[PDB]
Amino acid sequence: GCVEVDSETEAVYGMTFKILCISCKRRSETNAETFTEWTFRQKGTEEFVKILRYENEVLQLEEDERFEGRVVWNGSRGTKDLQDLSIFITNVTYNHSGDYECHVYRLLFFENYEHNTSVVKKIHIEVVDKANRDMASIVSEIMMYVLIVVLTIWLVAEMIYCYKKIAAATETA
Amino acid sequence: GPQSFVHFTKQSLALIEQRIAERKSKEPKPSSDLEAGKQLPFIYGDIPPGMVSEPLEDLDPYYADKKTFIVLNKGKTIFRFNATPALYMLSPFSPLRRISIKILVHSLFSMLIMCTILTNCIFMTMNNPPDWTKNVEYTFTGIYTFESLVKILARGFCVGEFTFLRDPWNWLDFVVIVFAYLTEFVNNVSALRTFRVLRALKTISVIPGLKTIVGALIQSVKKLSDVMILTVFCLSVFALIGLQLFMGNLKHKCFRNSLENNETLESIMNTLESEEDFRKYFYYLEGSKDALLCGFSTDSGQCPEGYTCVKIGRNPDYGYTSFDTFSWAFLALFRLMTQDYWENLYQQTLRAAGKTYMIFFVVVIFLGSFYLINLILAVVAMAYEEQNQANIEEAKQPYWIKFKKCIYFIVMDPFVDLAITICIVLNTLFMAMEHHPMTEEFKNVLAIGNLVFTGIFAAEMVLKLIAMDPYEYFQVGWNIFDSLIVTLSLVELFLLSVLRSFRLLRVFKLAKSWPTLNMLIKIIGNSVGALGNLTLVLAIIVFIFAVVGMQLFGKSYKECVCKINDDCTLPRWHMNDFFHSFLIVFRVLCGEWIETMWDCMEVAGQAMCLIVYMMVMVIGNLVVLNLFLALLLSSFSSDNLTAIEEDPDANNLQIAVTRIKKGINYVKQTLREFILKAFGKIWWNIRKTCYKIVEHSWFESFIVLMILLSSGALAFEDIYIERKKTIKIILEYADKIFTYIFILEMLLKWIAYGYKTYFTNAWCWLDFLIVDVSLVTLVANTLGYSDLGPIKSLRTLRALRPLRALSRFEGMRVVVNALIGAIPSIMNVLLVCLIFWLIFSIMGVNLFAGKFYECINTTDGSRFPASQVPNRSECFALMNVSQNVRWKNLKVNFDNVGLGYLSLLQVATFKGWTIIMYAAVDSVNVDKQPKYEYSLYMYIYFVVFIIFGSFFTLNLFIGVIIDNFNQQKKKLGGQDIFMTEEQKKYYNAMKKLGSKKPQKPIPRPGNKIQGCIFDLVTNQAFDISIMVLICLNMVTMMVEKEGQSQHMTEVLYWINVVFIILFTGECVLKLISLRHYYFTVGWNIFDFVVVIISIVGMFLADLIETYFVSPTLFRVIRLARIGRILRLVKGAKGIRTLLFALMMSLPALFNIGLLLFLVMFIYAIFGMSNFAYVKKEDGINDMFNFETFGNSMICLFQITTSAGWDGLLAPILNSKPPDCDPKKVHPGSSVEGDCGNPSVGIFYFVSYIIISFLVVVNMYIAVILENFSVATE
Amino acid sequence: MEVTVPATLNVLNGSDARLPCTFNSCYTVNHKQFSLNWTYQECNNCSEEMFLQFRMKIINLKLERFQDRVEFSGNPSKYDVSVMLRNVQPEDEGIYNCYIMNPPDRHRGHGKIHLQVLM
């Protein structure tokens, strides 16, 4: 079903990037009508500026020079019950490094009851020139190689010692 | 001597008079062979003509001192009367007495009574009777009173021995008659009608032979006292544990966060009454009668946004499903033990409390539900065996001749029988080609084929009747059977669906050459021959219960119908008429007694419904168990007596195959002749070193550790693994290390053992295959083809990596050896079951092929009433107007034989059968809208199947598996086949704790006061006082309920603390008395441990409710009080031996449970891999799914007992729209679609419920039986 | 629905009469849903006069021929729906009918009493 995966935090200059904002309901059988707004506080700036708003299957990009002609919708499509609210930057620059916020306004429709909730998700994004390798991947590869070599060395030492002992005993007999 | 037939005369009376005078002056045993109701001994020959039915002198010399005489009957039976005048008025020499004696001993009298009772049993079955039945009931009353009058005139009312009242059944007759007059003159009417059903019990007295069967049943139930005491004790202990843990947890509901007009929860609750009122304030799932349960824990249920969890309201299921009081907890625990709809309680409790509470259900199901049932079955088996052994011991103590001979040469040849068998098999497999959407040409060819087959069989009947006269043809049972089938075939040809399926019984002609299909026929014949009286008693009991239930609750079910049905119409299962009452009784016998009982209580009172249902359950299950075990033991022992030789006259099939193989040999030799006429010293030390390495304990332990790590690494691949990226990376590199680890272990074993010694070993073959799969996957991933269709699908076989622990673990190897040993008999019985079920599957296909379609309103899921939309064309026209309408079909039905097999499995396992039965009884025709119970009497099909199929097929399966295990044990030489060599020593040592003689009494101490303490504490009075104190403490623990006042809570706390001080005082007294000798006894140190843990637990609970808030820890810690009441076992020798049997059986159950856990782990990994994204439907919900290892294990444990497997399979049979969406996008994952895979799902669940049937039941019963036999010795 | 009423009720002139009308519905008597319709007719073929009723509270229409002598005397919460009547005049002799409907029950009952005034 719906799993709230976090977004990444590093975009390479000149390529495409996807900012994930997934918000699942507490119960998956409830009805809702969701719309979202994204803000952005560029690194070196103190204010969060609204950049876009998506409601009723139509994305309304605010007049912003940093994001004009580069952002497209990239989330749940064809419904008013949005659970994946991701946007997709088609051409990263250096004006896209900053703190994002993904405001979710969900309106649950119950029986003789309507609940208007709200969620905020914050994504810090840093732009780089070359894609760094994962520290976890590096350490996993290194430890795998050292474990393999250590086990093989132990096995070969046992093999040689046992061979010398067995042959010595056999020639003694 | 036949001169002993002397009449009872006046001189005989005078001789008895002188003998009684000598008896008075005088101030042995009667002959058993001469006791009334038996035949005369054959020494007495034939009765003289003038002596039959006449008062003869008492033939038994035992009664030579008493005025008793004998009347002999045609049919050679003896009635023993009394010569003391009847009613102190009529002497034995009176015309009335002579006439009445003759009437009573006549057999037409008994036949008339039987006919009258069987006629009255039909008028008992009218929910409302016509107004003229009063004359008929007057006639019945007259006949009964005449019969009683004749009996009283014949043998005196109550004047000494052998009088009317002296027989306990005459008490029943007298009560019947006084009720009949009192209700007609003195005049609850329903209660009086329930007493009219007492007239049915006169069948047992009238029909010969049923009285001894009833007596045997009573003497059997007298043997279950210890087992029922243990059952009550265990249910009470588990009910106390449940009342401690789950008290009030089922009153959790989601309540609205935002309330208007200053309203509060209490103000809301003081006003609501209707479900439409509650639905505005609590969260109700669509189509649910109960508010959704929530929980305060992390793993409990989740309320929606805007709803919060609060404890208020009533418990689910009308308020009857609860742990809020000891009585309701006891009902819940009895339900859990009998495993009746226990999965609903499982899910409710897990949702309300948390998923970590499944340990309670695991312990309850695998300790009380299975072990107590096996104890009951073993005790009943012992009772039957001893009774049967006693029975065996007492038994031991011109132109026509031309064609006659020609057709006799023709038809009785061995080859004709083989041809007929081939034709029978072809006919069966040709009938099994019917489906629902069948084209007209296919229908035509099927009709033509059936015509050809019936023509062949009719010709064969005619040939065998002209080859030998009817006087000899009709002398064979098989010939009569074939004649009946064929004449039915011609009847149906000249004229239905049923009569077409009548032909299918011809399959039983293969029972001659199929030994394990003859066992089924032997069981079925025993059910109506040797055990016919048991079957008749069961039928009478079921009839009585059905009529009693109807008379009591039929009017209530109609008056109070809106309390149990929203439409104010009678539900599906009710007791308003005889057929539905019988259906309810039969369902109770099948084992479903709670869902109907809830409606029973709602309409007509907890007390009455509980009493009736408990009586029905206990008595019916006892009788059914008696019949089952009698059939099993009789068929699988008494049939083994070496009667006649193994096929003395070889069957025609055997002679035909012998001729065929002779011809094959002749052809082989002739063709052979025709074709021949026409035309390095260091390598050995290397191998020795590798052997020394692979055989080392360090290497083996290292490999076992890596196997466990690689098995456990599979459980982290949830759907939530995209949130665990570091773990993802770590697990990928670890897989490579493990492949490198198991690849080096594979190469050393190749060089250490040799290719031949390696590859001629199944365990090594399994490891070879697993590592080959891993290597192929690794190579394909390295080459970049990681997504190539079948290569991607090959990654799902990584769930087989746990299979490498079977060879490593000795207990799991020992257990898995027994299964491989028993496989052949399993295949035999499975083939018999498939052949037997094919008949019912073809019959069901011909009955309900394509009639389960209906036009539903998809929003409500409600069938449109057939007044509007009477067919599929009108349904289509209505879809064209609306939008949420659909012409739907059931997912498991009878469209073809393949789906018929699945439907029959669901019916036979009693899981999901109700949906099929409802659709079957609603079915109208093809392309026609179902009507409510249009075909009501299609329930009979399922009744007959559940009987012939579900019952006799389990009598055959159990017998063959228990015989296979016994033969394996005897092959090993009387050695346990479920225990390892290391555990055998522990078993042998433990066996000696049940027979050690009492030791020397501990000597008195030296101090005077210490000696006095010794005499005080070493006393039976002290022991009895301790027992009664423990009983009082148990009662104080039972008197605790939910919502009790704070005053009662405090007084209960003080009552408990005083008990603590009393038990600590007795322990201290025994210590100061017995010095250091106290700890030499296991029960004494158990008591010491219980004392200290009780003190510590009281202190800790007080701490955790004073300086810390942790209700769950408080509830868990308060379970230390159960130690004080577990001590009742010390003084109950009846249940102590049964607990010793359980202790004896533990070692084998450990191995069996280990194997079961590994199998469950493998299936859980497969489920996570496959069914993680199916649509949330039926039994797949937010908390019970396959999205996580925990959820998968919970579901698999639920269906290990074969519960809810239909509801878990149903969401997986979806595969095409609008059932599923093949292109659904799942947030946070790259998988697309929520459709299931029908074939994989069916294989998964059927194989998993097949594994559980032969493991949790076939291996469980055997271990418990042997060890009970050992403990009871 | 089963309604138990006396077929003939004989009272003396100047005495009080309690008209026993009781029923035994399975369901609880919801006062928000109960419906009463007490009627009087001088003969079986005579028309009926609507004089005492329950809808949410006991409402007595206070007919002139009964004056202020008719009040409620049963209890719907315990399934008794009788009506009292002081100093029964000889004119009060006639036929009294109690009609009861108790949702969610479907069947509708009727209880008839012939009140007779003795000298």
Ligand SMILES: NC(=O)N1c2ccccc2C=Cc2ccccc21
């Ligand atoms: N203990 C046994 O050997 N049997 C027998 C005895 C004879 C025939 C078959 C069987 C088979 C199974 C079985 C089932 C329950 C109790 C005993 C029992």
